Design a protein around this nucleic acid. Structure first.
Ligand SMILES: [Mg+2]
Ligand SMILES: [Mg+2]
Ligand SMILES: [Mg+2]
Ligand SMILES: [Mg+2]
Ligand SMILES: [Mg+2]
Ligand SMILES: [Mg+2]
Ligand SMILES: [Mg+2]
Ligand SMILES: [Mg+2]
Lengths: 69, 145, 63, 107, 67, 141, 80, 206, 141
RNA sequence: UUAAUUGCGAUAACGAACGAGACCUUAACCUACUAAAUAGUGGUGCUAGCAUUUGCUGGUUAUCCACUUCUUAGAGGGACUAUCGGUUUCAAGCCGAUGGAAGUUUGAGGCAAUAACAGGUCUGUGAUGCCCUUAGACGUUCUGGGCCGCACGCGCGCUACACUGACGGAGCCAGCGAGUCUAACCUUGGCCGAGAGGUCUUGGUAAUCUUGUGAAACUCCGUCGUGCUGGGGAUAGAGCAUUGUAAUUAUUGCUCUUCAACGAGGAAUUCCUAGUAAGCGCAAGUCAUCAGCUUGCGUUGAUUACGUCCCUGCCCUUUGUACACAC
C-alpha cells in the first residue's frame, strides 16, 4: 500500500515538495506522501547532509525539521 | 555507521519453496512466511548468504535468491551448528533435518500418526485432539483443540 | 454571543442531589450592584470570576 | 602475663535491649578506672526477624495477617586489656538472658 | 479531628485553677512548667495539656472563661 | 587539559572505542558472532552483527575502568534484562556467559585488563592509557 | 552433667499471677467444687491479695447440652 | 551576559539562562499574559521553571494545584491508559517535541498557544444529573474556573491520545495539532467539538 | 588547612553527599562533570542551583558529590539539593550573612526542595491489598 | 462539633468505669552527646597509575593520622494544629496565611469494650464429650494411580490487543530479606558450553561474603512503519540441561520451529483521595525443583474531590405492629 521503494517518478514528489514544508518528520512524509516509514527516515537524513532543510532537535522516535535560513 | 541512497530496481511478487512470499518488506521477515522458517532461521540464512538485510526482498537478484534456498535446505554445510534446526536427532535415521514449507505439516502428520499407531499417550490425546502437554482442561480450551 | 462576566463573593452552601453542585452569591463585573445566586459545579472560592451566558436566571434547588 | 595486651573483642547480643545497654555501659565503665585504652561500644543494625502468618487456624473468614517481630540487638567493643583484668570481670556477674562472646584478634 | 479529650481539658482546667500566677502566655515555658508542677506519663500528653493550657490562657486574658 | 574517561559522554565513548577497535582489526572475534542471541533473555540477534562485539568490548572496557574489578558473573547480570516469558510475567535472567567470558579474554590479549588476583579482572596500564587517548580526542576535536 | 542445674524458688504474692491462679481455678473443679463458688473464690482471693482488678471467664457446657460463658469480674480492668 | 570560567566546562547556550529563566532553552514566560480574562489566578504564569518536571505537592489542599505551573499540569495528563502510568520522563519528552512542532509552525510562542487553547477549550457551562433514580432529568449549571482549566487539559489530552492510538502520527504530533487548532478555534479538534457539545446540552437542559 | 564543608541532600531513598571546598569551579558528581549528569532531559534539574544565583558565585568553590540510593530521578533531586545546601553551608561559615541570605531567599522563592527534604515517604503495604490503600477485588457472586 | 458517647453546651440528673482517646511499634528531622577496620569521609606516615603542572582512580590504618556530615543505634530533643487573621452561641471547633523535618488523629499499623452469631475450624494439637471401628482395621506402612481428568457455568488472577510500542545495542539507579559445620545454604572469582547448565576454587554462622543483590519499568542511539504486522504468544514437534530413587499424564530451564484467539470488551461490576492510584520489578513465605499466588520492600509516579445522602450499607430519633424461632 506504501511506496517502500523510491524511484524517479516518486523522487520528484519529494524534492519539489520538501521546500515550503514548515514541519518535516517521519509521519508527515508518509501522510502527505505515500512512501513508507523506513524510507521516510532515509529521506529525512539524506536531505539534511546537503542542507536544504534545517534541524531543531535531534531525537529518536520523533523528528523536528524546518526550512533553511 | 552510515546510510547510502538507493535506486528502485524493484521487482514484483515472488515464489520460493512452493509458497507465496510477498515483497515490499525486508528479506529476513519475508522468508518467515515459509513454513518451518522463523525469524532466527531466516536471519541466519541471510547472513550466511552474505546479503544486505536492507534489500526489501524485492530488489535482490536471482543469484542470491538461489543462494538462500541452498543454505536453507542444507544447513550443516554452511556453518550451522546443528542446535539451530527444526528437527534434531531424527528418530528414524539420526540426522538433523530442518523441515521446510510443504514438509512441516507432513512430517508433523507422520509424527502424530506414528504415536496413534504406537498408542502412546501424547498421540492418543491427539486422536481426540485434546491437550497433549498435560495442561488442565478444567475451564480452558472450550473453543478448539 | 456577548457573554458577561461575574465575580463570586459568597459561597452560600453545597446543593445538589449527590452534593457535587455548589450554590454561590455572585455579583456582576459590568453593572455592579446586580447580585444574583447561581449553581456552580466545579471547585470554587471567593473572587472567582466566572462567565454567565445568560443573566436572567436564579438558582431553584436550594436548602 | 607481665602486663601484656591481649586485644580482646567483646560482642553482646540479645533480644532484651535495655539490660544489654547497662552491661555495655558496665563494660565501658570498668576501663577508664583501670586506665584501659579502648575502642568504644559499636552498635550494629537491629535484625528484625519477621513471621507473616494467618490469624485463622482454618481457612474461613477474611484473610487477616499478623507480623511477629523478634528484635535482636548486637553490639561489640574492642578492649586493649591485660589478661588478668578481663577474666575476673567477665567470668563473674553475668546478666540474665544476654549472650556474650569473648574472642581474640592478633592482626 | 483535633478535639481535645477530657483528660487534656480537665488537667488544663485544674492546672489554671491552682497555678495561674506561675503560668504565662508561652507554650515553650508552659510545657516545662507542666513537668515540675504535674506528673504526666508521656511527652505527647504533656504537650497536649500544656498546649490547651496556653490556649486557655489566651482566652482568659480577653474576658473570663466559664468553669 | 587533564582528561580521564569520565568527562566524555557515556553513549559516545562506546561508539568511539568500538570504531577504533573496528579500525584496529586485532580483537580476534570468536567467530560464533552473527549467530548468538548474546543473552538467554534476548529473542533476536544483534542488528549490527559486524560491530556489536566491538561495542560490547567498548562497554566492558569502560566498566573495568570505572570500577575496581569485575568478573564474568557481574557482567552477566549487568547486560541482562527482562525476558518475555510468554503467558507468564517478566523475569530477570543473566546475559550470555560465553560471550562475556571471551570478551574479557579478547581484552586480555590486547592487554586492556590484568589478571587481578583479588577477584575478577582489573584495568591494565596500557589498557587505561588508550582509553584516555580516545577520551581526549572526543572532547578535543 | 553440671552444665545445667535447676533452682527451685518460691513465688511472692500468688494472688497477682494469673497462671498460678488459673491452675488452682482448675484443680478446684477437678476436686468437685461448684463452678460459681470456685470462680468467686479466685476473684476474691486475687482482690484481697492486692490486685487492682480481676476477670474470670468459664466457657463450655455445664448442666446443659448448650454451652455458655460466665463472667465473674471485680474491680478495675483495661483491655487496649 | 558576560562569560565566566570554571574548572568544569559549561556550554554557552546554558550559560545565558542566568539572565532570563525560560523553559528548556527556548521559550520564555514573559509577555505570555492570558488575554482571555476570568482564568487568571488559575493558569499559572510569571514564575518560570526550566523543565516541566517537578515533584511538588499539589494534593494536600483544595486549591493548591492551581498554583502548580500550567506546563506541569499538561504533562500529568499524558500519563494515562494504565501502561503509561508513571513514566513522566517520557511525557516531558513528548511536550518538548510538541512545543517544537508549534514553533516550526505558528511563529507565536507555544506557551501562549497552549494558554490560548486552554481558554478556548473549557466548557463555560455544564450539566448535572438531578433525580433520585436512573430515569431522571438533567439540570444546567455554570462551571468554576478550576474545573474549566481541569476540563480544558482533559479535553485536549484524551482526544490527542486516541488520535495517536493505532496511527502513524506520534503523540507529540497529535497533541501539537490539537493545541494549535484549539488555540485559533477550528471546530475540527476533539476538544473544541466536545466543549460545544457540552455547552449546547447546558443550553437545552436549562 | 583547606576550608571545606560537608553536606547532603535527600530524596525518597537517594542521598547525595557534597564536599564543598575552595578552588576554581569544579562541579563533579560521581567523578563526572555536572554537564554529564543523566538523563539529559533533567540536566536543568541540577542547573538551577547554578543558574539562578549566578555562576560567578563559583569562582572560588569546588563541589564534590557522591550519590547512592533511590533511582534515576530521585538521585538528580538528591544531587540538586546537596549542592544548594552545600553552597549555603559554605557561605554560612566563610561568607557574610547578606550573601548567604540572598542565596537562601533565592532558593526558597524558586523551590523549597533545593534545601528542604521531600517529607513524603513510602507507605507500608497492607494485607488483603496490593498496595497501601488498594484492596483485592471482591465479587459477591 | 469531632474520626470518635470527641467535646462545647442543654439538663432530674450528679459524680464515675470500660471502650474511643491517651498508650506502644514504625516513618519523617537532629552539622547537638556517645562512638565505630564489620559504616563512611578527608589529609597522609607509605604511596601508585593515567593524562599534565593537578583532575579521575587502586591498595596499607606499629605498610598512618583525624573525625562523625552522610550509615548505624543508645540516651534523648522535637509538634502542641505553634503564630497571625477570619468565622462559630464569639464555646468546643473549623478555615486560610506564615514558620517549621513534620500542621490529613503528622503518615501507617499493634492492642481493642458490652452483648452475640447454632459463622468457621473435631482435617493443627498427645484439647476433648459422645458414638462408630479396632487384626481381612476406618491404626500404620509399602506399590501405583487421583486430587491436574472435560460438552459447560462462575470467581481471583497473568499476557495482550500495539508506535506513549516490539526488538537490537549502549547508559545504567533501590530497599525490605535470607543464608552451611546439627554438610551443602547463599554463592563470588577462573575455565568449558549458544543457552540452560557443568566444573576448579574463594568468602561468609554474616553492617564483614554472596551483595553496591550494577532489579525492572526507565534514558539515549538505531531497525521496524499502521500491515492480525517485527503486535500477541496460545497450541504443537524435535533436541540440549537441572532437581528428584522416580519427570510418562509433558516439575521446570534453554535452542530451533507453528505464529491461534484478541482490532480496547454487553448486561453488569471492583478498588482508590498523595508518595496515594497505577505501572515496574526485587526480596522473603511455601520450597529437592517449579509463582502466573501471598506477605513486605523499593523504582517511576497521575487524574480528580476536599463534598453529599442520589443509590447501597450501618446507626439513631419519632412512629406503626396481630412480629419476639423476631418479615
Ligand atoms: Mg483507657
Ligand atoms: Mg469519653
Ligand atoms: Mg484440588
Ligand atoms: Mg544498596
Ligand atoms: Mg512478538
Ligand atoms: Mg504474526
Ligand atoms: Mg498458596
Ligand atoms: Mg398502623
Amino acid at each position: 500500500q506504501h511506496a517502500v521503494i523510491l524511484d524517479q517518478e516518486k523522487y520528484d514528489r519529494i524534492l519539489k515538495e520538501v521546500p515550503t514544508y514548515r514541519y518535516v518528520s517521519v509521519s508527515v512524509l508518509v501522510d502527505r506522501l505515500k512512501i513508507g516509514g523506513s524510507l521516510a527516515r532515509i529521506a529525512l537524513r539524506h536531505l539534511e547532509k546537503e542542507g536544504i532543510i534545517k534541524p531543531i532537535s535531534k531525537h529518536s522516535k520523533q523528528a523536528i525539521y524546518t526550512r533553511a535560513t | 555507521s552510515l546510510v547510502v541512497q538507493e535506486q528502485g530496481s524493484f521487482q514484483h511478487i515472488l515464489r520460493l519453496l512452493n509458497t507465496n512470499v510477498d515483497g515490499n518488506i525486508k528479506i529476513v521477515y519475508a522468508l518467515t512466511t515459509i513454513k518451518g522458517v522463523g525469524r532466527r532461521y531466516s536471519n541466519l540464512v541471510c547472513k550466511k548468504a552474505d546479503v544486505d538485510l536492507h534489500k526489501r526482498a524485492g530488489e535482490l537478484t536471482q543469484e542470491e535468491l538461489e543462494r538462500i534456498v541452498q543454505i536453507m535446505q542444507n544447513p550443516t554445510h554452511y556453518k550451522i551448528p546443528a542446535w539451530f534446526l527444526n528437527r534434531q536427532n531424527d528418530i528414524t535415521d539420526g540426522k538433523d533435518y530442518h523441515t521446510l514449507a510443504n514438509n512441516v505439516e507432513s512430517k508433523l502428520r507422520d509424527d502424530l500418526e506414528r504415536l496413534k499407531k504406537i498408542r502412546a499417550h501424547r498421540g492418543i490425546r491427539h486422536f481426540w485432539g485434546l491437550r497433549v502437554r498435560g495442561q488442565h482442561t478444567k475451564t480452558t480450551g472450550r473453543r478448539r483443540a | 454571543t456577548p457573554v458577561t462576566l461575574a465575580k463570586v463573593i459568597k459561597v452560600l452552601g453545597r446543593t445538589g442531589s449527590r452534593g457535587g453542585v455548589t450554590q454561590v452569591r455572585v455579583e456582576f463585573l459590568e453593572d455592579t450592584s446586580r447580585t444574583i445566586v447561581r449553581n456552580v459545579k466545579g471547585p470554587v472560592r471567593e473572587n472567582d470570576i466566572l462567565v454567565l451566558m445568560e443573566s436572567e436566571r436564579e438558582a431553584r434547588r436550594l436548602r | 602475663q607481665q602486663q601484656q595486651i591481649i586485644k580482646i573483642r567483646i560482642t553482646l547480643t540479645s533480644t532484651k535491649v535495655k539490660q544489654l545497654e547497662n552491661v555495655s555501659s558496665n563494660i565501658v565503665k570498668n576501663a577508664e578506672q583501670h586506665n584501659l585504652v579502648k575502642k568504644g561500644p559499636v552498635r550494629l543494625p537491629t535484625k528484625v526477624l519477621k513471621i507473616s502468618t494467618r490469624k485463622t487456624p482454618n481457612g474461613e473468614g477474611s484473610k487477616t495477617w499478623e507480623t511477629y517481630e523478634m528484635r535482636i540487638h548486637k553490639r561489640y567493643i574492642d578492649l586493649e586489656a591485660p589478661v588478668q583484668i578481663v577474666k575476673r570481670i567477665t567470668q563473674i556477674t553475668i546478666e540474665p538472658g544476654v549472650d556474650v562472646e569473648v574472642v581474640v584478634a592478633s592482626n | 479531628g483535633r478535639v481535645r479529650t477530657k483528660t487534656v481539658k480537665r488537667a488544663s482546667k485544674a492546672l489554671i485553677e491552682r497555678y495561674y500566677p506561675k503560668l504565662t502566655l508561652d507554650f515553650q515555658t508552659n510545657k516545662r512548667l507542666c513537668d515540675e508542677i504535674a506528673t504526666i506519663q508521656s511527652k505527647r500528653l504533656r504537650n497536649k495539656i500544656a498546649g490547651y493550657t496556653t490556649h486557655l490562657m489566651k482566652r482568659i486574658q480577653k474576658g473570663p472563661v466559664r468553669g | 587539559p587533564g582528561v580521564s574517561v569520565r568527562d566524555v559522554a557515556a553513549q559516545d565513548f562506546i561508539n568511539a572505542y568500538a570504531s577504533f577497535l573496528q579500525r584496529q582489526g586485532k580483537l580476534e572475534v570468536p567467530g560464533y558472532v552473527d549467530i548468538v542471541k548474546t543473552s538467554s533473555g534476548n529473542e533476536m540477534p544483534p542488528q549490527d552483527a559486524e560491530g556489536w562485539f566491538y561495542k560490547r568490548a567498548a562497554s566492558v572496557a569502560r566498566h573495568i575502568y570505572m570500577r575496581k574489578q569485575v568478573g564474568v558473573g557481574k557482567l552477566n547480570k549487568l547486560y541482562g534484562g527482562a525476558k518475555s516469558r510468554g503467558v507468564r510475567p517478566y523475569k530477570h535472567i543473566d546475559a550470555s556467559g560465553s560471550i562475556n567470558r571471551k570478551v574479557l579474554q579478547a581484552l586480555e590479549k590486547i592487554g586492556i585488563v590484568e589478571i587481578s588476583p583479588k577477584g575478577g579482572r582489573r584495568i591494565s596500564e596500557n589498557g587505561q592509557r588508550d582509553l584516555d587517548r580516545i577520551a581526549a580526542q572526543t572532547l578535543e576535536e | 552433667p553440671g552444665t545445667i542445674v535447676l533452682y527451685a524458688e518460691r513465688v511472692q504474692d500468688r494472688g497477682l499471677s494469673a497462671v498460678a491462679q488459673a491452675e488452682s481455678m482448675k484443680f478446684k473443679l477437678l476436686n468437685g467444687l461448684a463452678i460459681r463458688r470456685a470462680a468467686y473464690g479466685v476473684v476474691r482471693y486475687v482482690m484481697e491479695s492486692g490486685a487492682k482488678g480481676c476477670e474470670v471467664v468459664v466457657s463450655g457446657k455445664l448442666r446443659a447440652a448448650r454451652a455458655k460463658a460466665m463472667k465473674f469480674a471485680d474491680g478495675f480492668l483495661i483491655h487496649s | 551576559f558576560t562569560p565566566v570560567v570554571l574548572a568544569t566546562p559549561i556550554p554557552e547556550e546554558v550559560q545565558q539562562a542566568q539572565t532570563e529563566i525560560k523553559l528548556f532553552n527556548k521559550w520564555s514566560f514573559e509577555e505570555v499574559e492570558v488575554k482571555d480574562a476570568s482564568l487568571v489566578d488559575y493558569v499559572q504564569v510569571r514564575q518560570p521553571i526550566f523543565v516541566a518536571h517537578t515533584a511538588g505537592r499539589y494534593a494536600n489542599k483544595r486549591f493548591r494545584k492551581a498554583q502548580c505551573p500550567i506546563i506541569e499540569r499538561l504533562t500529568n495528563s499524558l500519563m494515562m491508559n494504565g501502561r503509561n502510568n508513571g513514566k513522566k520522563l517520557k511525557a516531558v519528552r513528548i511536550i518538548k517535541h510538541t512545543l517544537d512542532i508549534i514553533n516550526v509552525l505558528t511563529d507565536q510562542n507555544p506557551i501562549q498557544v497552549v494558554v490560548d487553547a486552554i481558554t478556548n477549550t473549557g466548557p463555560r457551562e455544564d450539566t448535572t444529573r438531578v433525580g433520585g433514580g436512573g430515569a431522571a432529568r438533567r439540570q444546567a449549571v455554570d462551571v468554576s474556573p478550576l474545573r474549566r482549566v481541569n476540563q480544558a487539559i482533559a479535553l485536549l489530552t484524551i482526544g490527542a491520545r486516541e488520535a495517536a492510538f493505532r496511527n502513524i502520527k506520534t503523540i507529540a504530533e497529535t497533541l501539537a495539532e490539537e493545541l494549535i487548532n484549539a488555540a485559533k478555534g477550528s471546530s475540527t479538534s476533539y476538544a473544541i467539538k466536545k466543549k460545544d457539545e457540552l455547552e449546547r446540552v447546558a443550553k437545552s437542559n436549562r | 588547612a583547606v576550608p571545606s564543608v560537608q553536606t547532603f541532600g535527600k530524596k525518597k531513598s537517594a542521598t547525595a553527599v557534597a564536599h564543598v571546598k575552595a578552588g576554581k569551579g569544579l562541579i563533579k558528581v560521581n567523578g563526572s562533570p555536572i554537564t554529564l549528569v543523566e538523563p539529559e532531559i533533567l540536566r536543568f534539574k541540577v542547573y538551577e542551583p547554578l543558574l539562578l544565583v549566578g555562576l560567578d558565585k563559583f569562582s572560588n568553590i569546588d563541589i564534590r558529590v557522591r550519590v547512592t540510593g533511590g533511582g534515576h530521578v530521585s538521585q538528580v533531586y538528591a544531587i540538586r539539593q546537596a549542592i544548594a545546601k552545600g553552597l549555603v553551608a559554605y557561605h554560612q561559615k566563610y561568607v557574610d550573612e547578606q550573601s548567604k541570605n540572598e542565596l537562601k531567599k533565592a532558593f526558597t522563592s524558586y523551590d523549597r526542595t533545593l534545601l528542604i527534604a521531600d517529607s513524603r515517604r513510602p507507605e507500608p503495604k497492607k494485607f488483603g491489598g496490593k498496595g497501601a490503600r488498594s484492596r483485592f477485588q471482591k465479587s459477591y457472586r
